[PDB]
Amino acid sequence: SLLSLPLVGSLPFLPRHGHMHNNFFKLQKKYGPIYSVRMGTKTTVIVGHHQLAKEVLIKKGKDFSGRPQMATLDIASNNRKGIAFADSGAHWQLHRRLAMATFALFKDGDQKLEKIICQEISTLCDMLATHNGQSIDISFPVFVAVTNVISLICFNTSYKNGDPELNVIQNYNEGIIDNLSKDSLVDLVPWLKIFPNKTLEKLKSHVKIRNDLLNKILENYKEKFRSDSITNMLDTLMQAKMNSDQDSELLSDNHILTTIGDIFGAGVETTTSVVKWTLAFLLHNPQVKKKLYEEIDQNVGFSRTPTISDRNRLLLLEATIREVLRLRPVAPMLIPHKANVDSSIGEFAVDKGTEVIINLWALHHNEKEWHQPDQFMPERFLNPAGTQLISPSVSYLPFGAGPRSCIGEILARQELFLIMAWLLQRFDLEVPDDGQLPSLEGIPKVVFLIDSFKVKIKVRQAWREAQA
Ligand code: HEM
Ligand SMILES: C[C@]12CC[C@H](O)CC1=C(C#N)C[C@@H]1[C@@H]2CC[C@]2(C)C(c3cccnc3)=CC[C@@H]12
Numbered sequence: 001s002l003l004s005l006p007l008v009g010s011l012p013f014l015p016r017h018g019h020m021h022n023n024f025f026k027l028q029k030k031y032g033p034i035y036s037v038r039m040g041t042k043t044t045v046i047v048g049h050h051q052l053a054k055e056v057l058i059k060k061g062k063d064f065s066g067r068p069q070m071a072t073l074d075i076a077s078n079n080r081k082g083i084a085f086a087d088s089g090a091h092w093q094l095h096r097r098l099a100m101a102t103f104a105l106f107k108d109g110d111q112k113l114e115k116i117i118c119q120e121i122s123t124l125c126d127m128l129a130t131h132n133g134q135s136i137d138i139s140f141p142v143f144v145a146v147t148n149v150i151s152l153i154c155f156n157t158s159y160k161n162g163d164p165e166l167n168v169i170q171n172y173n174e175g176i177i178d179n180l181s182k183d184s185l186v187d188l189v190p191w192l193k194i195f196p197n198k199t200l201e202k203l204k205s206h207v208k209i210r211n212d213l214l215n216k217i218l219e220n221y222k223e224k225f226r227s228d229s230i231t232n233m234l235d236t237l238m239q240a241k242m243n244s245d246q247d248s249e250l251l252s253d254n255h256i257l258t259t260i261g262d263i264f265g266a267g268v269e270t271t272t273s274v275v276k277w278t279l280a281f282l283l284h285n286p287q288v289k290k291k292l293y294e295e296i297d298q299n300v301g302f303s304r305t306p307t308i309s310d311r312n313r314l315l316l317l318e319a320t321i322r323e324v325l326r327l328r329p330v331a332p333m334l335i336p337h338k339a340n341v342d343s344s345i346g347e348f349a350v351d352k353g354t355e356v357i358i359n360l361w362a363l364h365h366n367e368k369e370w371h372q373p374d375q376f377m378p379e380r381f382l383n384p385a386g387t388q389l390i391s392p393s394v395s396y397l398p399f400g401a402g403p404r405s406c407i408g409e410i411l412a413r414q415e416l417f418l419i420m421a422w423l424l425q426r427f428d429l430e431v432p433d434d435g436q437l438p439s440l441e442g443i444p445k446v447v448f449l450i451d452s453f454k455v456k457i458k459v460r461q462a463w464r465e466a467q468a
Contacts (some may be wrong), residue, residue, distance in 0.1 A: 013026075013027065013028075015188050016182075019332075021184060021444065025365065034373075036145050036354075039188065039189070045357065047357065047363035051346075052346050053360075053386065053395075053397065055345055058405070060344075063343040063404040064337045064338070066338030069404050075200060075204055078211070083407070096242075098233075099263060103407065103410060105122065114307065114414060117414055117418050120146075120149050122136050123161070124142065124144070125422055126427075133459050135433060135457075136454060136455065138455055141454060146272055148270050149411075150268060151264070151265055154233045154264055157217075168213065169210075176207065180203065180446050182441075183444045184332075184333060187291070204344060210261065218256065218260070227242060231451065233260065233263060237259060264406070269414065269447050270447060271412055271415045271416060273330060273448070275416065277328045278324045280453065281323075282320075283429070284437060293424060295315075296317075297318065300425060302425065302465075306416070306423065307420060308417070314421060316382065319380075320420070322381045323376060327364070331448070332359075334360055337357070358400075360397060363397060364395065364462055369393045370395075399412075425463060428457075429456070
């Protein structure tokens with residue numbers, strides 16, 4: 001009759017074993033779609049069912065629109081400025097509205113968002129075409145294309161080919177994403193505070209390069225700014241600073257710096273990442289990819305290059321994108337939410353300041369809401385006749401919802417569709433000469449990245465004949 005050992009701590013699973021978003025998901029078979037963990041004083045709630053998720057994001061969105069405070073996120077956002085890592089309050093509301101207003105501009109005009117995107121995609125396809133017959137990592141080329149686009153939206157500026165600044169930006173992007181969090185942003189145990197490490201040291205130095213670069217651009221642009229011409233995001237932010245000079249403290253330089261940084265960062269890493277994910281799946285699914293070549297041929301052909309209007313006709317492509325955004329969400333656990341006030345979820349009590357995580361991965365893989373969810377099946381987003389798109393499930397939130405939903409969704413959907421439409425029209429994208437296929441397991445960082453891989457690019461037999 002022995003006594004049981006006193007218990008000091010208890011965690012449901014091993015830390016740093018498997019992907020957090022899948023460990024939390026597997027836990028639901030034991031504890032249900034909502035449960036909590038406690039770290040000292042901090043408490044975290046994980047939510048794995050869509051009804052509970054739509055409560056947190058929508059029905060009670062404003063109750064749960066805060067952002068928790070993390071040492072790394074402070075450095076990366078210059079102490080909780082910007083949009084994504086700014087808590088709910090005066091600053092976030094202002095900057096999210098102005099960022100949303102800038103995008104609203106790019107409704108068709110002399111800078112119809114499509115035209116910006118298409119100009120930089122056309123450059124890209126000319127690069128890739130020089131690698132005709134070779135196996136390459138497509139990361140940096142697509143990085144350049146989207147970097148020019150968001151740079152145009154932010155400053156009406158693009159980078160000429162070969163600009164060494166692009167290599168500088170790529171370098172500090174990888175540096176921050178590396179040290180922003182070991183894996184997912186949700187970290188059960190606070191490892192950086194426990195043991196000696198250089199993580200915040202490294203993070204600071206990449207942020208110093210990033211802030212110094214954006215500071216050059218901004219100080220430069222004060223001399224280009226004319227109140228009669230408000231055509232990009234920096235114009236928008238300065239105009240606002242101009243008009244208010246309680247809002248002048250909200251639109252300081254450091255504030256404007258961070259918002260632009262948030263946009264410049266999100267616009268490149270998310271879309272570049274989703275493109276790589278899509279090619280990876282197509283290399284694993286030639287049957288899909290063949291069907292995609294047929295689709296484009298019988299609806300766009302080679303008389304001309306694809307267009308946003310072509311979303312009507314290239315449905316299997318729209319479907320494919322939907323299915324990638326489901327299988328491999330950019331933010332499989334969104335960005336951590338925080339309870340701004342005493343509230344409830346599923347009529348369980350949630351106290352002020354409590355961290356709340358939506359397990360978007362659990363929503364996209366719940367077997368009751370999805371037919372064979374771990375499968376790549378773009379067909380699930382099409383009626384059985386292949387003729388129009390459908391919403392097969394209610395647990396599908398690739399861009400979130402509510403007060404914190406994605407602000408660059410429109411941009412993302414158009415960049416994604418045009419990149420994949422131009423590439424399939426022009427190139428056979430096949431497995432390299434080594435038998436290697438990309439690992440579809442992914443790498444959970446602040447964004448769900450795919451390990452780098454190589455694709456063999458060949459100009460299409462058809463696209464060639466159409467040049468005579
Ligand atoms: C396919 C690409 C993308 C996907 C799937 C995506 C999805 C998401 C998701 C799921 C969130 C979570 C919001 C939350 O924390 O609840 C989010 C937030 C956000 N996204 Fe995206 N996004 C994409 C691309 C972009 C782009 C191109 C931009 C360009 C500016 C952008 C800007 C943002 C910002 C600023 C936030 C934070 C908003 C806030 O905290 O209020 N994203 N996005
Ligand atoms: C971390 C990163 C990328 C590296 C860059 O050097 C610095 C950076 C940002 C800045 N400045 C904003 C972040 C973005 C990553 C994507 C983020 C987290 C993002 C997001 C993440 C997932 C989906 N949609 C948007 C909102 C803020 C963006």
